[PDB]
Design a protein around this motif. Structure first.
Motif, PDB file in Angstrom:
ATOM      1  N   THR A  35      10.376   3.378  -0.371  1.00 44.85           N
ATOM      2  CA  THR A  35       9.428   4.221   0.897  1.00 44.85           C
ATOM      3  C   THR A  35       9.206   2.811   1.556  1.00 44.85           C
ATOM      4  OG1 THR A  35       8.670   5.902  -0.434  1.00 44.85           O
ATOM      5  CG2 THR A  35       6.880   4.576   1.199  1.00 44.85           C
ATOM      6  N   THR A  66       9.689   7.190  -5.176  1.00 42.83           N
ATOM      7  CA  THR A  66       8.566   7.822  -4.605  1.00 42.83           C
ATOM      8  C   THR A  66       8.201   8.608  -6.887  1.00 42.83           C
ATOM      9  OG1 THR A  66       7.429   6.184  -2.987  1.00 42.83           O
ATOM     10  CG2 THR A  66       6.541   8.109  -3.658  1.00 42.83           C
ATOM     11  N   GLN A 118       1.605  -2.895  -5.824  1.00 44.84           N
ATOM     12  CA  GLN A 118       2.531  -1.269  -5.899  1.00 44.84           C
ATOM     13  C   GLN A 118       2.081  -0.332  -7.118  1.00 44.84           C
ATOM     14  OE1 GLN A 118       6.737  -1.338  -4.690  1.00 44.84           O
ATOM     15  NE2 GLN A 118       6.179  -1.961  -2.000  1.00 44.84           N
ATOM     16  N   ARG A 164      -4.255   4.050  -1.599  1.00 49.94           N
ATOM     17  CA  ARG A 164      -4.788   2.602  -2.143  1.00 49.94           C
ATOM     18  C   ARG A 164      -6.258   2.430  -2.177  1.00 49.94           C
ATOM     19  NH1 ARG A 164      -4.930  -3.277  -2.063  1.00 49.94           N
ATOM     20  NH2 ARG A 164      -4.478  -3.143   0.134  1.00 49.94           N
ATOM     21  N   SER A 219      10.000   9.188  -0.669  1.00 54.29           N
ATOM     22  CA  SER A 219      11.459   8.672  -1.047  1.00 54.29           C
ATOM     23  C   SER A 219      11.788   9.236  -2.625  1.00 54.29           C
ATOM     24  CB  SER A 219      11.831   7.265  -1.132  1.00 54.29           C
ATOM     25  OG  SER A 219      10.769   6.319  -2.473  1.00 54.29           O
ATOM     26  N   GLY A 258       0.703  -1.242  -0.125  1.00 56.74           N
ATOM     27  CA  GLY A 258      -0.202  -0.078  -0.377  1.00 56.74           C
ATOM     28  C   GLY A 258       0.827   1.150   0.206  1.00 56.74           C
ATOM     29  N   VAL A 259       2.200   0.743   0.070  1.00 58.27           N
ATOM     30  CA  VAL A 259       2.718   2.638  -0.376  1.00 58.27           C
ATOM     31  C   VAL A 259       3.160   2.250  -1.700  1.00 58.27           C
ATOM     32  CG1 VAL A 259       4.304   2.152   2.361  1.00 58.27           C
ATOM     33  CG2 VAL A 259       4.711   0.976   0.650  1.00 58.27           C
ATOM     34  N   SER A 260       3.729   3.552  -2.377  1.00 61.59           N
ATOM     35  CA  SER A 260       4.453   4.313  -3.491  1.00 61.59           C
ATOM     36  C   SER A 260       5.230   3.657  -3.994  1.00 61.59           C
ATOM     37  CB  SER A 260       4.556   5.599  -3.285  1.00 61.59           C
ATOM     38  OG  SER A 260       5.118   5.964  -2.193  1.00 61.59           O
ATOM     39  N   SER A 261       6.515   2.748  -3.495  1.00 61.49           N
ATOM     40  CA  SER A 261       7.658   1.836  -4.271  1.00 61.49           C
ATOM     41  C   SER A 261       8.597   1.410  -2.995  1.00 61.49           C
ATOM     42  CB  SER A 261       8.636   3.070  -4.337  1.00 61.49           C
ATOM     43  OG  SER A 261       8.997   3.890  -3.422  1.00 61.49           O
ATOM     44  N   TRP A 295      -0.230   0.153  -7.715  1.00 68.63           N
ATOM     45  CA  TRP A 295      -1.455   1.178  -7.610  1.00 68.63           C
ATOM     46  C   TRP A 295      -1.061   2.721  -7.719  1.00 68.63           C
ATOM     47  CZ3 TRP A 295      -2.096   5.002  -3.901  1.00 68.63           C
ATOM     48  CH2 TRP A 295      -0.369   4.984  -2.604  1.00 68.63           C
ATOM     49  N   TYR A 296       0.091   2.816  -7.066  1.00 67.25           N
ATOM     50  CA  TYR A 296       0.279   4.094  -7.095  1.00 67.25           C
ATOM     51  C   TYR A 296       0.552   4.521  -8.584  1.00 67.25           C
ATOM     52  CZ  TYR A 296       2.997   8.706  -6.154  1.00 67.25           C
ATOM     53  OH  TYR A 296       3.765   9.399  -6.151  1.00 67.25           O
TER      54      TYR A 296
END
Ligand SMILES: O=P(O)(O)OC[C@H]1O[C@H](OP(=O)(O)OP(=O)(O)O)[C@H](O)[C@@H]1O
Ligand SMILES: O=P(O)(O)OC[C@H]1O[C@H](OP(=O)(O)OP(=O)(O)O)[C@H](O)[C@@H]1O
Ligand SMILES: NC(=O)c1ccccc1
Ligand SMILES: NC(=O)c1ccccc1
Lengths: 464, 464
Positions: free
Chosen positions: A183, B183, B134, B372, B180, A177-180, B136-137
């Protein structure tokens, strides 16, 4: 990785904008006035991105070529960067002073300062604002996680009279559920400042490489099901799935997601009757952990406990709260953030259920649903030297007093009553307030002071 | 990077939880029922993390030693990972089928499917759920960025009669405000699907490496001030800062942050009177862009426009809206997200100001304040083969019908009216709806189908 390409584009043009004859730019980071913040994550950035030979002939050329097209114009400071390459073998002429990692500091205080150590490099101080400000993220995760720990400690203490197992009450479920990937590691490491339970494996290597623990690992997990490992058996065979799983993991804790079809049926009839015999035989070191994963988180938790309390022997602890047998626990890992966590422990307390019974898993609420806005993490120039004269500088926007920045050279001190104060305008030099709590952590391409992860955990402990 | 350590911990234990003699696990990703999503970002993941030899003897040993400590127990599937190393030289026996990148698809449709291509590797399908989810981002960044493009297009067309300059109306300010470096690159790249203006330099190299463009760079910037480059001149010398900066960048567009002390004074007295002669002389391709950065974003934008409108020659365009002279523009870069952007353009329209006059910069709103949850991005097993028998699997939680998942082998199709439909239970094989729109993009360690960034941009275009 190329540090010349790791800034906001406009900063490429700032060397031409500062007053002429400026030999020094000095800047600081604060969480502008969640009353107190855990300072964590700078050491990661220092080592990964800032230390050593960060400039090469090739990196200067690459940047020159990109910016020529990005700006459609020659604005890149090639001379400035080349100067760093030739004179310092590509090492950054920067000093950074920071409060020790793990320290818990009230809002509106200096956490670190950045200045150039060679007059030619006045423009470098704020070049690296972008990369340093990203420290907001581990600060905010560590802070929000610790805040949840206070809530958990409070209700666990009240309902049970102690804090045993507190370190295991908020599990990191946030990897997906994080962006990378990057991260994931950072955020997971920040949560481990406060807790020991994690499924975000990426946190482990980051900590081992950048910080270090005496223990082999900073965080731990247990076997646990997902919907694929239950539903794969077929809708009519949820019981077979449950039986297989608890039997495979008979002598360690095992978490079993129980809401694939009907959480209430699963609790009352499958666990509570059909498979009861495989649960009541379990060790205290190896409980069944039932996991709801849908519905209103508070209504679901309370209804699940009600069901279980009618199917399994409940005791009453010395505080008067209901306690399930030690071989049976619940983990709520759906829709968990600081707000819903508070609502659940409070609702439990109301219905006379000990917090001993419950643990939480949190994904986005823990690692993603956070913004630089939450703690007003901000980096501003407070001091320059122009024609050999120091002047105190700051912003003070008319429509927003909260955005006023601090003036001059800054230092962080303990107050007589044991609190914190940031002294401005170089007033820390007057020595009325004991020593500056900021320490040089980076100077001229070298990391000059490090903290282990064990020290950081100690610094970030709760009061109690 | 080690893919054996890039999963949720619990997934390390799942090989022991599936029904015995399971030869196939087949899973799919959807954005469960912002009504349409831009599919973007999978290709980055495929190339960076999943393709080629991703298993080595050293990576198996590393994972074995970590999990031994992390679980305090030997759950890790050393044999299963060794099988992949020995049999396939560390290439993943997996097939991934996906909708083409840049495609704009309604919610509740299959976006990609994952399945194992060797019966022994049935546990691999969901091992890589965490890394693939991931996506999702980039999906969410691209979708939210495109949603903002729709709003800007609507108001620019209403107030001006065309879309000239639309692709430069929302500028990425979010480098410092993400969690990050990785990201930053991913998210900045997703915004560039829709727009051309960016300060998040990290996005450029990502696109060049993973997607490719006909142009030298996918995104552009202009010189701009920050508070350090104004405030460094001293509070009494804001005018000198302004004069120096616009003269340094006299023949390119220049953004100048104008709210250090008093935004309204800066516009009315400094720009509007003292330095007016240095603005009215500027080219149409080198405007001064005045940047407020504080206060109520709408109130501030309206007042700034009213001030400038009284100091500079305003015209009325063919739609009846007020237009500043071409050498003068405004950029609102504070507190911008999809909601406040909508508020500002509507409020401007209300006061008869063309959207030609305004551009936006957005940081956290664009790249960080996203989760998410926003599109309900979810990965679930829908089909398995056990004892040679294929069965359609799914979850259907009693308390949440929104979380019901799809059954069986899936395909994406065009309806007779030209919309989208996802067929379940292998029904695509009946060919009543034409050919499946998913393509194999990954098979057995190889990327088998690719899209340039230029193809993605074209797929992601607005209706107009
Ligand atoms: O931080 P969060 O984003 O809230 O993560 C926690 C949730 O993640 C997993 O579900 P899944 O990935 O299947 O999502 P879903 O429950 O919404 O379907 C898990 O079973 C929890 O429901
Ligand atoms: O969309 P956001 O994530 O808010 O980013 C945009 C903001 O960031 C910068 O300010 P700074 O870094 O000084 O933040 P501040 O204005 O809150 O101090 C910039 O001058 C904008 O105010
Ligand atoms: N261990 C778990 O139950 C879990 C579930 C979802 C995501 C991460 C972890
Ligand atoms: N170019 C800008 O004004 C800017 C401001 C803040 C962050 C990034 C860029």
């Amino acid at each position: 990785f190329n540090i010349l390409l790791a800034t906001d584009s406009y900063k490429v043009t700032h060397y031409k904008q500062y007053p002429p004859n400026t030999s020094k730019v000095y800047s600081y980071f604060e969480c502008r006035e969640y009353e107190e913040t855990v300072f964590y994550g700078l050491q990661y950035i220092l080592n990964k991105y800032l230390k050593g030979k960060v400039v090469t002939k090739e990196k200067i050329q690459e940047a020159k070529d990109v910016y020529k097209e990005h700006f459609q114009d020659d604005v890149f400071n090639e001379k400035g960067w080349n100067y760093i390459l030739e004179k310092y073998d590509g090492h950054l002429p920067i000093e950074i002073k920071a409060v020790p990692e793990g320290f818990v500091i009230p809002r509106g205080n200096v956490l670190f300062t950045v200045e150039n150590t060679d007059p030619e490099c006045y423009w470098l101080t704020n070049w690296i604002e972008t990369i340093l400000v990203q420290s907001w993220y581990p600060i905010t995760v560590a802070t929000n996680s610790r805040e949840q720990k206070k809530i958990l400690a409070k209700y666990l203490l009240e309902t049970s009279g102690n804090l045993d197992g507190l370190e295991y009450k908020l599990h990191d479920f946030g990897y997906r559920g994080v962006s990378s990937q990057e991260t994931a590691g950072i955020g997971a490491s920040a949560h481990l400042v406060n807790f020991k339970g994690t499924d975000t494996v990426a946190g482990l290597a980051l900590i081992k490489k950048y910080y270090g623990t005496k223990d082999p690992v900073p965080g731990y997990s247990v076997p646990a099901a997902e919907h694929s490992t239950i539903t794969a058996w077929g809708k009519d065979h949820e019981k077979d799935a449950f039986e297989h799983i608890v039997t495979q993991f008979s002598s360690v804790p095992v978490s079993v997601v129980s809401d694939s079809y009907d959480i209430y049926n699963a609790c009352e009839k499958i666990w509570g009757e059909d498979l009861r015999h495989l649960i009541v035989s379990r060790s205290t070191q190896a409980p069944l952990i039932i996991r709801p994963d849908s519905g209103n988180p508070l209504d679901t938790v309370l209804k699940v406990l009600e069901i279980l309390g009618k199917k399994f022997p409940v005791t009453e602890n010395s505080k008067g709260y209901k306690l399930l047998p030690p071989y049976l626990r619940v983990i709520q890992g759906d829709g968990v953030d600081i707000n819903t966590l508070q609502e659940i422990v409070e609702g439990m307390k109301q219905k006379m259920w000990s917090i001993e019974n419950i643990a939480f898993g949190s994904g986005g609420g823990l690692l993603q649903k956070l913004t630089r806005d939450l703690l007003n993490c901000s980096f501003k120039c407070s001091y320059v030297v122009t024609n050999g004269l120091g002047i105190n500088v700051f912003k003070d926007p008319v429509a927003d007093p909260n955005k006023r920045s601090k003036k001059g050279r800054l230092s962080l001190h303990r107050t007589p009553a044991g609190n914190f104060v940031t002294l401005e305008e170089g007033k820390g030099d007057l020595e009325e307030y004991g020593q500056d709590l900021l320490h040089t952590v980076f100077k001229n391409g070298k990391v000059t002071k490090s903290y282990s992860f064990d020290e950081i955990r100690k610094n970030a402990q709760l009061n109690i």
